[PDB]
Amino acid sequence: AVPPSLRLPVIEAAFPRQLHPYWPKLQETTRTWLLEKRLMPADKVEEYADGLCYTDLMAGYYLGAPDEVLQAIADYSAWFFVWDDRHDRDIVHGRAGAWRRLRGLLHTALDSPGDHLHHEDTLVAGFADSVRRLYAFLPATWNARFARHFHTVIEAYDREFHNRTRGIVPGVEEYLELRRLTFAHWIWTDLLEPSSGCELPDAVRKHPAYRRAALLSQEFAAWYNDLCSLPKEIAGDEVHNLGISLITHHSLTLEEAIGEVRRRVEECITEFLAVERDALRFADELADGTVRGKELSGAVRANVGNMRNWFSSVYWFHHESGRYMVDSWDDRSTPPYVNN
Ligand SMILES: CC[N+](CC)(CC)Cc1ccccc1
Ligand SMILES: [Mg+2]
Ligand SMILES: [Mg+2]
Ligand SMILES: [Mg+2]
């Protein structure tokens, strides 16, 4: 039973879950990779990695991906979680220098990953490995777009570092802009493309219905993370959360803030249902009888299908993953799967 404050009957009824058939291999392979790259200690991998459900999250999202693509995505996603953990720990421990250096290394590695495959910081080496693999599926133009987007993400993490160090809780609109970057909206949207085997031309992926469907899928996911992760975040002195911005700047109680975030999440769902009809119409229109049109149609249709799958995968992930089980920790401020 999903807690009533977090339950969304529309997702439960109208967004049936899907699971990629590679998932059981994926679970094992990403666990092995976390170990091999030394991204988490062996005993914590053994106790916690499967329970974190990071592979499940991605296997419920990128349906139809080639197995090798899903593996690179899942390893990169598990890396991304560990990076969120490292960032958090650097802030909590006041490691401004170590964070600045990591930030610079990630920008460099993102542009030249093969050069960093054996870097002394295993977090940089693990990033480089996953990124090098992601850069092997589609043309350099897509790689450059992924890099452009992720440079922006790294800087949004840097902004979060300074917000937390200075005690600043962003305003509501400032936060909503920032959250499109810290949640990596455009990275997940970029990754739809190797998942369906096609770098989409700008004129296709920038079609207003494709853009809007892509945006709403990520806003839902990010704001639903905010709703579910709020208790762990308050316990850990995290300030980045739509609920915390509302409590801090709109004088809402916790109860009022939860309700307002819920209402925003629910509106994303029904806005998405409306634009999804337009995005699927567009997919149909691309199928103009030509070979290229059939390719583009199939790719848009698969991508929009996965924009829909993200709703259910993210919904259930928050109820299944050990990541958010703060009630089970002895020290609510220190999740047991993080390196403290
Ligand atoms: C640290 C969390 N994460 C992805 C690694 C950062 C972009 C956002 C996220 C949280 C929960 C579900 C899906 C994505
Ligand atoms: Mg976090
Ligand atoms: Mg974060
Ligand atoms: Mg969160």
UniProtKB/Swiss-Prot annotation:
Signal peptide: none annotated. It is an enzyme of class 4 (lyase). It catalyses: (2E,6E)-farnesyl diphosphate = (+)-epi-isozizaene + diphosphate. It comes from the Bacteria. Mg(2+) 3 binds at N225, S229, E233. Keywords: Lyase, Magnesium, Metal-binding. Binds 3 Mg(2+) ions per subunit. Can also use Mn(2+) and Fe(3+) but less efficiently, and other divalent cations such as Zn(2+), Fe(2+), Co(2+), Cu(2+) and Ni(2+) are nearly completely inefficient as cofactors. InterPro entries: Isoprenoid_synthase_dom_sf (IPR008949), IsozizSyn (IPR054543), Terpene_cyclase-like_2 (IPR034686). A motif (DDXXD motif) lies at residues 84-88. Mg(2+) 1 binds at D84, D88. Mg(2+) 2 binds at D84, D88. Its cofactor is Mg(2+); Mn(2+); Fe(3+). CDD domains: Terpene_cyclase_nonplant_C1 (cd00687). One of its GO terms (molecular function) is terpene synthase activity. Pathway: Sesquiterpene biosynthesis; epi-isozizaene biosynthesis. Its EC number is 4.2.3.37. The Asp-Asp-Xaa-Xaa-Asp/Glu (DDXXD/E) motif is important for the catalytic activity, presumably through binding to Mg(2+). Belongs to the terpene synthase family. Catalyzes the cyclization of farnesyl diphosphate (FPP) to the sesquiterpene epi-isozizaene. This is Epi-isozizaene synthase. It comes from Streptomyces coelicolor (strain ATCC BAA-471 / A3(2) / M145).
